Design a protein around this ligand. Structure first.
Ligand SMILES: [K+]
Ligand SMILES: [K+]
Length: 256
């Protein structure tokens, strides 16, 4: 079909769907939650990661349709896991709050409905927000992010002077360190300085910190020594299909 129709169909049929990457407490290895990550199970091209299809969605103005679909799928999966394990702690699932959603009237009601129909505890679903999303309109971000916390969503600042100022106002609970910095910190002093800076801020200002792109034990151990709370990456597990994530969860030690 035409591009917009093809993408609306792939989203609506769930061809574009979440895989789930474990987020672990670095000091113990215990599972804290998962990140919901979009994949296109493309019928002709095979599985495609976001970097190979998101530009199409952006061009067609479909970020809200993709984001909604991802948030619904992520929340439903968490709900299923909660029902299966009624004594389990507050296992989280993070998902990107897609660009433009902060501006969309009706985001808050959607989030609230999603939390409540899935019976999710406060903070079980965490929404990831970037600096560039905030920068579109910081005033609207301050209103809407506060209201999302009142609805029961958690909030992470992904890819964490502008950001220091935004942090003072906005009710984030989690900071994420970009994989580039983690992967280059061993060999690049400036990347190590940035990693250390984010970790130290979280410790000083009581925000949790997630390192992305943790590839191996050397990297994990370096982050453990700094006191970074959490990690995700190939050193622990890739993004997993729902079926694989279920197995991972059932075999896991859960944080807390
Ligand atoms: K935790
Ligand atoms: K992300």
């Amino acid at each position: 079909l035409a591009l917009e129709a093809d993408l609306r169909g792939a989203i609506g049929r769930g061809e574009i769907t979440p895989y789930f990457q474990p987020i672990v407490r670095l000091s113990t290895g215990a599972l804290s939650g998962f990140e919901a990550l979009a994949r296109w199970i493309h019928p002709r091209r095979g599985m495609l990661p976001p970097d190979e299809f998101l530009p199409l969605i952006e061009e067609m103005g479909l970020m809200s349709e993709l984001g909604a679909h991802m948030m619904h799928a992520a929340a439903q999966q968490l709900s299923t896991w909660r029902a299966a394990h009624p004594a389990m702690g507050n296992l989280t699932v993070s998902v990107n709050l897609s660009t433009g959603e902060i501006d969309r009237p009706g985001l808050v009601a959607d989030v609230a409905e999603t939390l409540r129909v899935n019976r999710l505890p406060r903070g079980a679903l965490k929404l990831e927000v970037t600096e560039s999303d905030i920068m579109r309109d910081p005033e609207r971000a301050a209103v809407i992010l506060k209201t999302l916390r009142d609805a029961g969503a958690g909030l992470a600042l992904d890819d964490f002077f502008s950001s220091l100022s935004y942090l003072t106002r906005l009710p984030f609970d989690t900071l994420k360190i970009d994989r580039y910095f983690v992967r280059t910190m061993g060999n690049n002093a400036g990347s190590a300085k940035i990693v250390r800076s984010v970790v130290k801020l979280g410790q000083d200002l009581d925000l949790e910190v997630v390192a992305e792109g943790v590839e191996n034990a050397e990297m994990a151990h370096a982050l453990q020594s700094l006191g970074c709370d959490y990690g995700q990456g190939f050193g622990y597990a890739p993004a997993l299909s729902p079926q694989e994530a279920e197995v991972y969860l059932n075999e896991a030690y859960v944080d807390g």
